[PDB]
Motif scaffolding. Structure first.
Motif, PDB file in Angstrom:
ATOM      1  N   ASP A  46       0.801  -1.211   0.000  1.00 30.29           N
ATOM      2  CA  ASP A  46       0.000   0.000   0.000  1.00 30.29           C
ATOM      3  C   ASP A  46       0.831   1.256   0.000  1.00 30.29           C
ATOM      4  O   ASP A  46       0.362   2.298   0.469  1.00 30.29           O
ATOM      5  CB  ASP A  46      -0.959   0.010   1.182  1.00 30.29           C
ATOM      6  N   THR A  47       2.034   1.203  -0.554  1.00 26.75           N
ATOM      7  CA  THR A  47       2.940   2.334  -0.518  1.00 26.75           C
ATOM      8  C   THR A  47       2.558   3.374  -1.563  1.00 26.75           C
ATOM      9  O   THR A  47       1.428   3.401  -2.061  1.00 26.75           O
ATOM     10  CB  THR A  47       4.367   1.869  -0.746  1.00 26.75           C
ATOM     11  N   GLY A  48       3.513   4.265  -1.842  1.00 27.23           N
ATOM     12  CA  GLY A  48       3.256   5.378  -2.738  1.00 27.23           C
ATOM     13  C   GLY A  48       2.831   4.929  -4.122  1.00 27.23           C
ATOM     14  O   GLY A  48       3.269   3.896  -4.634  1.00 27.23           O
ATOM     15  N   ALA A  49       1.899   5.690  -4.701  1.00 21.04           N
ATOM     16  CA  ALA A  49       1.229   5.236  -5.909  1.00 21.04           C
ATOM     17  C   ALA A  49       2.137   5.318  -7.119  1.00 21.04           C
ATOM     18  O   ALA A  49       2.277   4.335  -7.853  1.00 21.04           O
ATOM     19  CB  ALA A  49      -0.048   6.036  -6.129  1.00 21.04           C
ATOM     20  N   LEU A  50       2.788   6.456  -7.328  1.00 23.31           N
ATOM     21  CA  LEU A  50       3.652   6.579  -8.492  1.00 23.31           C
ATOM     22  C   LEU A  50       4.914   5.744  -8.329  1.00 23.31           C
ATOM     23  O   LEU A  50       5.476   5.287  -9.323  1.00 23.31           O
ATOM     24  CB  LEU A  50       3.984   8.037  -8.731  1.00 23.31           C
ATOM     25  N   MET A  51       5.371   5.520  -7.087  1.00 22.78           N
ATOM     26  CA  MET A  51       6.530   4.654  -6.868  1.00 22.78           C
ATOM     27  C   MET A  51       6.238   3.239  -7.323  1.00 22.78           C
ATOM     28  O   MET A  51       7.070   2.575  -7.945  1.00 22.78           O
ATOM     29  CB  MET A  51       6.918   4.648  -5.396  1.00 22.78           C
ATOM     30  N   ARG A  52       5.039   2.773  -7.040  1.00 17.70           N
ATOM     31  CA  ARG A  52       4.643   1.488  -7.560  1.00 17.70           C
ATOM     32  C   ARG A  52       4.345   1.574  -9.047  1.00 17.70           C
ATOM     33  O   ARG A  52       4.425   0.567  -9.758  1.00 17.70           O
ATOM     34  CB  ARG A  52       3.443   0.981  -6.772  1.00 17.70           C
ATOM     35  N   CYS A  53       4.009   2.763  -9.553  1.00 14.28           N
ATOM     36  CA  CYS A  53       3.692   2.791 -10.971  1.00 14.28           C
ATOM     37  C   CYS A  53       4.955   2.849 -11.807  1.00 14.28           C
ATOM     38  O   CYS A  53       4.922   2.485 -12.983  1.00 14.28           O
ATOM     39  CB  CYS A  53       2.806   3.970 -11.342  1.00 14.28           C
ATOM     40  N   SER A  54       6.067   3.268 -11.219  1.00 12.89           N
ATOM     41  CA  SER A  54       7.297   3.471 -11.958  1.00 12.89           C
ATOM     42  C   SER A  54       8.021   2.187 -12.261  1.00 12.89           C
ATOM     43  O   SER A  54       9.062   2.227 -12.916  1.00 12.89           O
ATOM     44  CB  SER A  54       8.241   4.339 -11.169  1.00 12.89           C
ATOM     45  N   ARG A 109       5.689  10.407  -0.072  1.00 13.12           N
ATOM     46  CA  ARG A 109       6.938  10.242   0.648  1.00 13.12           C
ATOM     47  C   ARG A 109       7.858   9.229   0.004  1.00 13.12           C
ATOM     48  O   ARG A 109       9.015   9.130   0.415  1.00 13.12           O
ATOM     49  CB  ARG A 109       6.675   9.848   2.096  1.00 13.12           C
ATOM     50  N   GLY A 110       7.380   8.484  -0.992  1.00  9.95           N
ATOM     51  CA  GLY A 110       8.263   7.689  -1.810  1.00  9.95           C
ATOM     52  C   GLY A 110       9.243   8.548  -2.592  1.00  9.95           C
ATOM     53  O   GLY A 110       9.101   9.763  -2.716  1.00  9.95           O
ATOM     54  N   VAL A 111      10.272   7.908  -3.139  1.00  8.75           N
ATOM     55  CA  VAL A 111      11.334   8.669  -3.787  1.00  8.75           C
ATOM     56  C   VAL A 111      10.934   9.041  -5.207  1.00  8.75           C
ATOM     57  O   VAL A 111      11.067  10.203  -5.626  1.00  8.75           O
ATOM     58  CB  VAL A 111      12.637   7.871  -3.749  1.00  8.75           C
ATOM     59  N   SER A 112      10.386   8.068  -5.944  1.00  7.17           N
ATOM     60  CA  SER A 112      10.117   8.235  -7.368  1.00  7.17           C
ATOM     61  C   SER A 112       9.098   9.327  -7.635  1.00  7.17           C
ATOM     62  O   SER A 112       9.213  10.049  -8.630  1.00  7.17           O
ATOM     63  CB  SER A 112       9.637   6.920  -7.952  1.00  7.17           C
ATOM     64  N   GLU A 113       8.102   9.458  -6.753  1.00 10.48           N
ATOM     65  CA  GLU A 113       7.226  10.624  -6.758  1.00 10.48           C
ATOM     66  C   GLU A 113       8.027  11.904  -6.714  1.00 10.48           C
ATOM     67  O   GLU A 113       7.901  12.754  -7.596  1.00 10.48           O
ATOM     68  CB  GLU A 113       6.259  10.573  -5.567  1.00 10.48           C
ATOM     69  N   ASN A 114       8.931  12.011  -5.753  1.00  8.95           N
ATOM     70  CA  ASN A 114       9.527  13.306  -5.511  1.00  8.95           C
ATOM     71  C   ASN A 114      10.578  13.637  -6.550  1.00  8.95           C
ATOM     72  O   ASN A 114      10.969  14.800  -6.692  1.00  8.95           O
ATOM     73  CB  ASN A 114      10.083  13.327  -4.108  1.00  8.95           C
ATOM     74  N   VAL A 115      11.006  12.640  -7.314  1.00  7.55           N
ATOM     75  CA  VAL A 115      11.775  12.919  -8.519  1.00  7.55           C
ATOM     76  C   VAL A 115      10.865  13.390  -9.638  1.00  7.55           C
ATOM     77  O   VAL A 115      11.100  14.435 -10.252  1.00  7.55           O
ATOM     78  CB  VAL A 115      12.572  11.681  -8.933  1.00  7.55           C
ATOM     79  N   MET A 116       9.818  12.629  -9.932  1.00  4.55           N
ATOM     80  CA  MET A 116       8.986  13.004 -11.062  1.00  4.55           C
ATOM     81  C   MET A 116       8.024  14.118 -10.734  1.00  4.55           C
ATOM     82  O   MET A 116       7.336  14.594 -11.633  1.00  4.55           O
ATOM     83  CB  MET A 116       8.177  11.830 -11.576  1.00  4.55           C
ATOM     84  N   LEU A 117       7.911  14.505  -9.482  1.00  3.19           N
ATOM     85  CA  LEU A 117       7.307  15.785  -9.182  1.00  3.19           C
ATOM     86  C   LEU A 117       8.356  16.841  -8.965  1.00  3.19           C
ATOM     87  O   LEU A 117       8.017  17.945  -8.540  1.00  3.19           O
ATOM     88  CB  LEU A 117       6.397  15.690  -7.968  1.00  3.19           C
ATOM     89  N   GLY A 118       9.608  16.513  -9.258  1.00  2.55           N
ATOM     90  CA  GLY A 118      10.653  17.510  -9.364  1.00  2.55           C
ATOM     91  C   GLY A 118      10.951  18.184  -8.050  1.00  2.55           C
ATOM     92  O   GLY A 118      11.023  19.416  -7.984  1.00  2.55           O
ATOM     93  N   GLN A 119      11.080  17.411  -6.996  1.00  2.00           N
ATOM     94  CA  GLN A 119      11.157  17.978  -5.673  1.00  2.00           C
ATOM     95  C   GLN A 119      12.469  17.617  -5.013  1.00  2.00           C
ATOM     96  O   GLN A 119      13.198  16.731  -5.470  1.00  2.00           O
ATOM     97  CB  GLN A 119      10.028  17.477  -4.842  1.00  2.00           C
ATOM     98  N   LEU A 120      12.742  18.325  -3.929  1.00  2.00           N
ATOM     99  CA  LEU A 120      13.774  17.908  -3.010  1.00  2.00           C
ATOM    100  C   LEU A 120      13.420  16.528  -2.496  1.00  2.00           C
ATOM    101  O   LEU A 120      12.486  16.376  -1.709  1.00  2.00           O
ATOM    102  CB  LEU A 120      13.847  18.903  -1.862  1.00  2.00           C
TER     103      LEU A 120
END
Ligand SMILES: [Mg+2]
Ligand SMILES: [Zn+2]
Ligand SMILES: [Zn+2]
Ligand SMILES: [Zn+2]
Lengths: 84, 268, 551, 156, 107, 171, 93
Positions: free
Chosen positions: E46-54, E75-86
RNA sequence: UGGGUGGUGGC
């Protein structure tokens, strides 16, 4: 709501290298943007050497906000933490 | 698979949700590069060897300190006030020998990867402080005992003062304190190595500082380093071994190709 | 500075709120209803408003500004359109979950065939996870065959007592089989989507909450499309076939095909209709909406182009190695890189890499004009962009670019405190250095800049082991920081002297290679003697020798 | 730009929108009743705040046109001067003595409490017209409220 | 599990620190059963949605993202990359403030 | 209608402002930026309470830009009008289309169709006014009106009044 | 600057370099969001400086972002397939 | 300053 007093501080009182890296980057970015230097300037005029001249003396006006994984956070000053 | 695992500021191991995986990082709190394989000397050998190397005896003259190495040697022989210290410490090491013999390292192969290597610091102090001489020293046995015992409560991995903190502290560095007392016991220091006082205090301060500098850092993305550093010998590598065995162990099969048992038999 | 100013403040995204879309909110977000299959007016220069290339969507021409946002093409994100289908359709991506939902509930009142009376169902209600909640309700309801008129004195729960049908799936077309009575004629019939829409509009919010949905986000009459939106034409922009004619993107061809089948739907209900001419044009509408999002559906032939090729869907723009995520978002192509073939050079330190001069000319780095670097940076202006060591640009405090190949007058330019200057790649900067593919955490390592002619990359040969490079023609890349922050990031972590010891096997992985090694073993054999004179040079080569020979 | 703690308007029906609910929250998360201010209250706060700011800038050492010059910027000078003169000519209880007397007299929705003080009235008939929310509350004294309010109201 | 990994790596003389194998064998038994390394493992978290989608099957798992009103706090990593975040690690696992304490000590 | 409102303002500070008077600069900056401005959401922000003691907090350094972000929390006196709200006012001008009345910060327009019929605009009178027999609305006349519509420009708000009802008119 | 380069950047961990790479030397792109329905439907006129979330009549709860242009492309593609990514800028629970 | 297919070569 979240935040903890500065006396229950059970995290490690060291700077570690990742913390060190960000402090160097951000302090150097500020002193690149004309923030005046607290230490003497001998030949160290490139900003990274300026930053390491400060951290050598522990003269840094910043605060680490370590997000402890509830969400709360221990506001460590730079001045208290032991430079490695 | 691992790409978020971050060691936080409590020495634990969570994913994005907070599924904690190891309560203490790598079961020790120690950064993964910062080890060497050393020799916990109190595992091998017979009871004769241990009782000859370590067993102090302050009543019998000859099995005590040969008095050439210490200054205060007039002030010693017979005192049970210091004999009970040393009997407690010998029973301490018999406890540690039973500990590292029968709980942890059962088959007795003593070489293990353990952090900061003290022997190098000892001989570094020796070459610094000109330690030949074959000379009397002024460093007393009670200062050794209180130095070791006041060391073993200064190796804070998990800091704080709750009950599980102190319990996890003693669960944490049991093997490392076992190492220090496996080396820096009284007859070994004051015969085989011949320190002085000032060397010993420098030894104490430096073991402090470097077991502080080999704590793992927080935010070391250990899953990612881990995954790469297991994939990397997978690059350059009758039972199945190598890449398909690794594949089956990862992708977990209910049908691996050739399973096996390790069946001991009973002792008779 | 790289964006035009706005008054809405910068914030980063925190929470993705995934959800569906009502037909309503589609109708409330757009600016234009979509009508006409032709693109052009009558081939008359600004094509037809009411066709697919509405300038109220966002203009894909450089010189005509947008007619809704009023910006250029550089700033307009685009604006959604929507094409009002006459006949509501399935979304193609929900047909198993819509299958399960019409397996669950009544077909007259639309109510769940279990309540809190059956206690295993009453235990399954308590679950905080929506997904396995809907799994448990899906499990306990697939055995329940009859809509209870009664509660599962008449406690009429809401049902009428008619049975509940058996839900098959057949591609786009659903086949529900009631047990219309025991045994009598089973009417296996096509579940027309509008009938299920009228079913789905009759659901209580409690049956939304129990069945794994949420009302203000995912209301299961929103899984049937009455109104299929139109994206703005940035997502299907016309390509210059041979610099006068525009071949269109396949989304434009497919939305044209949809609008043609739309008008050929609305042509039948306005005249004499032989009742399966209706059925085929409706099923063709459903087909066009199916291939709009997916041309990979099992069992049926693909939607085909005018070359003999398949059509680029939206699903084909997202899956696969070269989709938008793995090919464009998780990893992508970028700039300030460089690339060459390498060469060894032992007359070097360990953290130095040779730089050919032209690569130093092309790439640059923005050093901030501060109060401690004015003089050299003015000199780097005075070298201009054809002379290393020099500069290419001054970014002002606002965003002004001054390309110094196109400027006569470098001599009359003072600079201001805090402007930005990109000088060339001079000595002693961090570079990243990197060989495809990465295999362990040393496979990117920082370095320092040494500038050499004769255009190849120079290395130390002790770093040959971690990158695993030989010299039969490898390519190694060179990314460049464009900020102060990332410079310090590299210089304190990814520098070679801090990555010597690999936690792979807790040992150093950068050692000695071929010649230095076999030579030093030939040197310090026991019977090797050297005269004093040659020894003078040999100890001169050490940079850390004090100035004292041994005895 | 500027935001608040909270994360069809009809004054007759007491519909004041999402920002002016009965229960507000301060910058610490604590619950708090909405602070509606009569013309007389507001005159005291604004005048006190302006002269207190002037004193703080002077390290600790009267007229409205001078008191409004404490603000920063001609836009602020304008709004504050126009607000003081309005309050100077319609605040019935122009001192804190009378104001606290009105405070205790009234202490019932916070909007109504401020209206009764701001709008001078003769009879109950005029109060339930201009403030149609007092209709279904059923607890007057209103008249002696208005009588005491009008008696407390200083001459001009 | 640990004995298996240490066997089949260190058959060819190659050497591995304990803590890396330990982290792998403990993530493989986080949840009381063998969360194996496929799409079935990570995407059925049940973790981050885009992290599982990547990782795999991004079409179906995006349809289950929007299909059930998920709240991904990213709070997953792949989200915060593809949302262009720190992203939350390294230097970005922790914010940095300005300090009224030390800037009061400053003149 | 006056309120006390708990508000906050995000202030971003450039590193060249990272000096010894940083907090005092931010407090002055808040006042310059917030006092006198109008929004449809809160109204006119009239004056900020306790300006010299505002707690500006600590500035978060924005990753990648060096600049610092402060959230300055404060409490102000705000004035927002409402449809239906009865208020007093002072007429500023009288013209053939009605009159304009100053209600504190802003100005209210009352049109002729929202003025009782017996009040007749008399230009020949000195000074010009809307007059009756016992009524007199000239410039500077205390009037009691009812706000019947609020329009928002986010810069200045525009309210239209009426005295075409009971107990409303000159006072 | 492929996948496994990003992998080794994660292993070093200095993600600020990664935010240089996948924002700033690439398709740096700026959009807007209405803070209520959470979407990017907000029409942007700038020299007239006005905005309208036309599904909401929202004119004030407006923020901008900094996302990759391909991420925006993902969002427009998805909303053209009827999935609704909504970006709320605060943690909710 | 095209797309989009397809082929051969480099590590
Ligand atoms: Mg090769
Ligand atoms: Zn536009
Ligand atoms: Zn029924
Ligand atoms: Zn909205």
């Amino acid at each position: 709501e979240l935040a903890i007093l500065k006396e229950e501080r059970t995290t490690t009182p060291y700077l570690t290298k990742y913390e060190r890296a960000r402090i160097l980057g951000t302090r150097a970015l500020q002193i690149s943007m004309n923030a005046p230097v607290l230490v003497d300037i001998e030949g160290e005029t490139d900003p990274l050497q300026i930053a390491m001249k400060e951290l050598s003396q522990r003269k840094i006006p910043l605060v680490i906000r370590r997000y402890l994984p509830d969400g709360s956070y221990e506001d460590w000053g730079c001045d208290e933490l032991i430079v490695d | 698979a691992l790409e978020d695992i971050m060691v936080h500021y409590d020495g634990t191991t969570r994913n994005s949700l907070g599924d904690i995986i190891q309560f203490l990082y790598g079961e020790d709190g120690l950064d993964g590069t910062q080890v060497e394989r050393q020799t916990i000397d109190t595992i091998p050998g017979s009871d004769k060897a241990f009782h000859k190397r370590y067993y102090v005896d302050l009543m019998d003259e000859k099995n005590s300190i040969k008095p050439d190495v210490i200054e205060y040697a007039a002030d010693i022989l017979g005192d049970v006030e210091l004999q009970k210290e040393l009997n407690s410490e010998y029973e301490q090491l018999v406890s540690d020998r039973k500990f590292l013999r029968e709980i942890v390292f059962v088959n007795g192969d003593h070489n293990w990867p353990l952090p900061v290597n003290l022997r190098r610091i000892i001989q570094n102090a020796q070459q610094i402080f000109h330690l030949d001489r074959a000379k009397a020293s002024d460093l007393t046995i009670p200062e050794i005992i209180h130095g070791v015992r006041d060391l073993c409560k200064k190796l804070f991995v998990l800091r704080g003062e709750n009950e599980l903190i102190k319990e996890a502290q003693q669960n944490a560095t049991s093997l490392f304190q076992c190492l220090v007392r496996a080396r820096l016991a009284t007859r070994r220091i004051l015969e085989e190595f011949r320190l002085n006082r000032d060397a010993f205090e420098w030894v104490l301060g430096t073991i402090e500082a470097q077991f502080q500098r080999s704590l793992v850092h927080p935010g070391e993305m250990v899953g990612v380093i881990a995954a790469q550093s297991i994939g990397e010998p997978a690059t350059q590598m009758n039972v199945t071994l190598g890449v398909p065995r690794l594949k089956e162990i990862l992708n977990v099969a209910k049908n691996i190709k050739t399973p096996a048992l390790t069946v001991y038999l009973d002792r008779e | 500075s790289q964006f035009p100013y706005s008054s809405a403040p910068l914030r980063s995204v925190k929470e993705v709120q995934f959800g569906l879309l009502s037909p309503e909110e589609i109708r409330a977000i757009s600016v234009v209803k979509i009508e006409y299959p032709e693109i052009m007016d009558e081939s008359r220069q600004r094509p037809r408003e009411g066709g697919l290339n509405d300038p109220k969507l966002g203009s894909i021409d450089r010189n005509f500004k947008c007619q809704t946002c009023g910006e250029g093409m550089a700033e307009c994100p685009g604006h959604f359109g929507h094409m009002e289908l006459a006949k509501p359709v399935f979304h193609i991506g929900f047909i198993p979950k819509i299958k399960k939902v019409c397996e669950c509930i009544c077909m007259n009142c639309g109510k769940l065939l279990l309540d809190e009376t059956n206690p295993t169902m009453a235990q399954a209600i308590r679950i905080r996870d929506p997904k396995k909640r809907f799994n448990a309700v899906w499990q306990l309801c697939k055995t329940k065959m009859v809509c209870e008129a009664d509660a599962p004195k008449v406690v009429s729960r809401g049902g009428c007592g008619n049975t509940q049908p058996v839900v098959r799936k057949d591609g786009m077309k659903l086949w529900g089989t009631w047990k219309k009575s025991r045994d009598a004629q089973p009417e296996r019939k096509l579940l027309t989507p509008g009938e299920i829409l009228n079913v789905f509009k009759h659901i209580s919010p409690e049956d939304c909450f129990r069945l794994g949905f949420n009302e203000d986000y995912a209301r299961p009459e929103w899984m049937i499309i009455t109104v299929l939106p139109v994206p703005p034409p940035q997502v299907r922009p016309s390509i210059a076939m041979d610099e006068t004619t525009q071949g269109q993107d396949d989304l434009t061809h497919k939305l044209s095909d949809i609008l043609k089948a739309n008008i050929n739907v609305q042509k039948l209900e306005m005249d004499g209709s032989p009742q399966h001419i209706i059925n085929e044009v409706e099923q063709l509408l459903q087909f066009h909406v199916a291939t709009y999002m997916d041309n990979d559906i099992a069992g049926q032939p693909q939607a085909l182009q005018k070359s003999g090729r398949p059509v680029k869907a939206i699903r084909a723009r997202l899956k696969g190695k070269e989709g938008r995520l793995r090919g464009n978002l998780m990893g992508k192509r970028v700039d300030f890189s460089a690339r060459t073939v390498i060469s060894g050079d032992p007359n070097l330190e360990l953290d130095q890499v040779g730089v050919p001069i032209s690569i130093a000319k092309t790439l640059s780095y923005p050093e901030t004009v501060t109060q401690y670097n004015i003089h050299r940076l003015t000199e780097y202006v005075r070298n201009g962009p054809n002379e290393h060591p020099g500069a290419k640009y001054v970014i002002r405090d606002n965003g002004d670019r001054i390309d110094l190949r196109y400027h006569k007058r470098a001599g009359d330019i003072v600079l201001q405190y805090g402007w930005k200057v990109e000088r060339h790649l001079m000595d002693d900067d961090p570079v990243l250095f990197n060989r495809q593919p990465s295999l362990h955490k040393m496979s990117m390592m920082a370095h320092r800049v040494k500038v050499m002619p004769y255009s190849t990359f120079r290395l130390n040969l002790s770093v040959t082991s971690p990158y695993n490079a030989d010299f039969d023609g490898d390519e190694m890349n060179l990314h460049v920081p464009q900020s102060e922050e990332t410079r310090a990031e590299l210089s304190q972590l990814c520098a070679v002297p801090l990555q010597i010891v690999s936690p792979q096997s807790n040992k150093p992985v950068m050692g000695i290679v071929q010649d230095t090694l076999c030579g030093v073993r030939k040197m310090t054999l026991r019977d090797t003697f050297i005269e004093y004179e040659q020894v003078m040079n040999m100890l001169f080569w050490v940079p850390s020798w004090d100035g004292v020979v041994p005895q | 730009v500027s935001t608040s703690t909270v994360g069809e308007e009809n004054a007759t029906l007491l519909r004041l929108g999402p920002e002016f609910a009965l229960k507000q929250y301060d910058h610490d998360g604590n619950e708090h009743d909405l602070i509606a201010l009569s013309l007389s209250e507001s005159r005291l706060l604004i005048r006190e705040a302006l002269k207190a700011r002037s004193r703080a800038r002077n390290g600790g050492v009267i007229d409205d046109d001078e008191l409004a010059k404490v603000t920063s910027g001609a836009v602020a000078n304008g709004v504050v001067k126009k607000t003081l003169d309005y309050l100077n000519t319609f605040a019935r209880f122009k001192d804190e003595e009378t104001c606290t007397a009105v405070d205790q007299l009234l202490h019932l929705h916070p909007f109504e409490i401020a209206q009764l003080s701001s709008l001078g009235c003769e009879d109950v008939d005029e109060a339930i017209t201009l403030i149609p929310s007092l209709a279904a509350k059923k607890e007057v004294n209103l008249q002696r409220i208005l009588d005491e309010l009008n008696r407390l109201e200083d001459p001009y | 599990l640990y004995k298996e990994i240490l066997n089949v790596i260190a058959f060819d003389g190659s050497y591995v620190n304990y803590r890396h194998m330990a982290l792998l064998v403990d993530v493989m038994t986080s949840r009381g059963y063998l969360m194996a390394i496929t799409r079935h493992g990570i995407n059925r978290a049940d973790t981050g949605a885009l992290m599982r989608c990547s990782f795999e099957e991004t079409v179906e798992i995006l349809f289950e993202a929007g299909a059930a009103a998920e709240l991904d706090d990213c709070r997953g990593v792949s989200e915060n990359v593809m949302l262009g975040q720190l992203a939350p690690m390294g230097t970005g696992a922790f914010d940095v403030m300005i300090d009224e304490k030390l800037l009061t000590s400053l003149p | 209608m006056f309120f006390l409102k708990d508000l906050s303002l995000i202030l971003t500070l450039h590193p060249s402002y990272f000096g010894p008077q940083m907090n005092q600069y931010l407090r002055e900056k808040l006042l310059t930026d917030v006092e006198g401005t109008c929004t449809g959401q809160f109204g006119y922000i009239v004056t900020v309470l306790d300006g010299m003691n505002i707690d500006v907090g600590k500035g978060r350094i924005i990753p990648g830009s060096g600049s610092a972000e402060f959230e300055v929390k404060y409490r102000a006196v705000v004035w927002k009008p409402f449809k239906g709200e009865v208020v007093d006012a002072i007429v500023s001008n009288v013209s053939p289309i009605g009159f304009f009345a100053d209600v504190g910060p802003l100005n209210v327009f009352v049109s002729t169709r929202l003025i009782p019929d017996n009040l007749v605009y008399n230009p020949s009178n000195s000074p010009p006014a809307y007059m009756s027999n016992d009524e007199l609305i000239t410039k500077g006349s205390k009037v009691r009106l009812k706000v019947v519509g609020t329009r928002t420009d986010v810069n200045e708000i525009y309210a239209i009044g009426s005295i075409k009802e009971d107990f409303l008119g000159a006072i | 600057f492929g996948e496994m380069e990003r992998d080794c950047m994660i292993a070093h961990g200095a993600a600020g370099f990664l935010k240089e790479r996948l924002m700033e030397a690439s398709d740096a792109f700026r959009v807007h969001v209405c803070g209520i329905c959470g979407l990017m439907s907000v029409i942007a006129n700038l020299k007239k400086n006005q905005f309208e979330c036309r599904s909401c009549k929202n004119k004030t709860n407006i923020y901008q972002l900094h996302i990759p242009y391909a991420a925006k492309l993902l969002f427009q593609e998805l909303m053209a397939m009827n999935i609704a990514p909504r970006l709320y800028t605060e943690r909710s629970g």
